Amino acid sequence: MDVLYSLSKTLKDARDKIVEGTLYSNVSDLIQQFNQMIITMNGNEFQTGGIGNLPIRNWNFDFGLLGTTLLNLDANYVETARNTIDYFVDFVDNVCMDEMVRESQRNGIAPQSDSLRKLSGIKFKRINFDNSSEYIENWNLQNRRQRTGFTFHKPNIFPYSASFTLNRSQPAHDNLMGTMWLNAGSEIQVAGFDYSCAINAPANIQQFEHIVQLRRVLTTATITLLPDAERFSFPRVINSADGATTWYFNPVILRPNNVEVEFLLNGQIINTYQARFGTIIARNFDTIRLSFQLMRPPNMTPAVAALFPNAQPFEHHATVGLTLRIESAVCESVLADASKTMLANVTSVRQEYAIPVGPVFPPGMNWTDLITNYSPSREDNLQRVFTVASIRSMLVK
């Protein structure tokens, strides 16, 4: 993988630096690297493809080196350079495809797409130029095990889950008490609802709690916590648990009182915020505990008191909501985001070349079913394919 990232980076820096009129004083080292790479590749015969609709290609490198006599580069030099770089580019592209389309449970870190296993050999290690990018850097760190990190903006770590929980239900669904929540992407929108407004509850107060449990720990996360969850704040018709019948939900928003948000880590509390709204921080956490309360307003006006009667009809249901978004984060493992295209490149290649379902990834790489079970095999294969996909995007976006 190191040699593949090296090929990609030197080809990028060749397409960028090697241009007519430029000066050999600026590209001497790059030309030395390129010539060493040609010397290493020339004579070897690679083969790529043979899965799904991926065509089978046989690469045979017989190239010539680049002179060092000139000072300024002429078209007679840039043209040979481009004729070579296009070949190496399509070769690296087909290798990254053949590696994004293969999986394995045993030794997912270890190279697949046997051409790449060959490239991993010791006669090919003379091409390493710089392992700078975040992905290859964390790769080398995991190989030489150390405290790693991937920095994410709006990470897709919550699987799409829209669901409720009813602590007091009936067949008619006329006096309900419970909590609804939608956890999707990087956002959680929770809302505790009481159809009675806590006329019967001790002290006219009803508690609500929602415990999220991430599959991978996060650090240095910046979070935006606001009240009055929007999507659970208008009329709704929902079905029952067993889908037999339906019920109505006419919410009326009140403000969360005595709100407490606790970011824990394997039962250990790490961060806690009591009624702080807006931008907040969490330095290390695996579990989130959002707790809020619904307190009957003691001082009511006529119009509002007409909405919370002392009997069962209850045509307005008191609600208490909360939105929470994870704007940035840092994770020891790989995920998906709203910024980087690696996931999309992988899934597009798979959809295009008609890759059957494998033993590790589910069909179509649905991020819900791929984040609900983040077993080390899946994690390693995901890191591998995302890394090589970033490598491929460094050349062909």
Partner: protein
């Protein structure tokens, strides 16, 4: 009897259950003169004496069983702690337990069958300054060794010094104690 042997001070998650059951007698440790700190029933009685001198509705037939409803329904949930070799073991009637070190706040597995052997005979302390707010404070309002030891010991001097330093992470806890002293 979990521990050395039968005491009747420890008579019974299973852990959380046992701890709540033991805390329903640590309330009696509180009103048996076997405490060291602000002794929550004391705060309850102070609220009582501050309310029944203001309330217009006070009468001879009326105060009886109001004193008792107060003593019974003031601060229903309340937590306690025990210190042993610079290791605090907490407990609460709400089924929550927290083990942690004094100097460096970091949790630990809660050692049951030792917490009981210790709370039985060693003095107990009250959770006015309970671990959650304590850690929030040690994070935001960085704290010194003596101040932290005195807050563990529940000293009214350092308590009032923070309350005059206007620390919202303690003002909120005290307001919660008031709102629990509601009747």
């Amino acid at each position: 009897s979990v521990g050395s042997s039968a005491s009747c001070w420890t008579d019974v998650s299973s852990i959380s259950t046992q701890t709540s059951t033991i805390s329903r007698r640590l309330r009696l440790k509180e009103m048996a003169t076997q405490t060291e700190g602000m002794n929550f029933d004391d705060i309850s009685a102070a609220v009582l004496k501050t309310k029944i001198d203001r309330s217009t509705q006070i009468s001879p037939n009326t105060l009886p069983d109001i004193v008792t409803e107060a003593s019974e329904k003031f601060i229903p949930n309340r937590a306690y702690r025990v210190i042993n070799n610079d290791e605090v073991f907490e407990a609460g009637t709400d089924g929550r337990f927290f083990a942690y070190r004094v100097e460096t706040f970091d949790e630990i597995p809660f050692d049951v069958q030792k917490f009981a052997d210790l709370v039985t005979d060693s003095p107990v302390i009250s959770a006015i300054i309970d671990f959650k707010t304590l850690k929030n404070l040690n994070d935001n309002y960085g704290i010194s060794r003596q101040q932290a030891f005195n807050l563990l010991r529940s000293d009214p001097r350092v308590l009032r010094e923070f309350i005059n330093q206007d620390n919202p992470i303690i003002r909120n806890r005290i307001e919660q104690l008031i709102m629990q002293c509601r009747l």
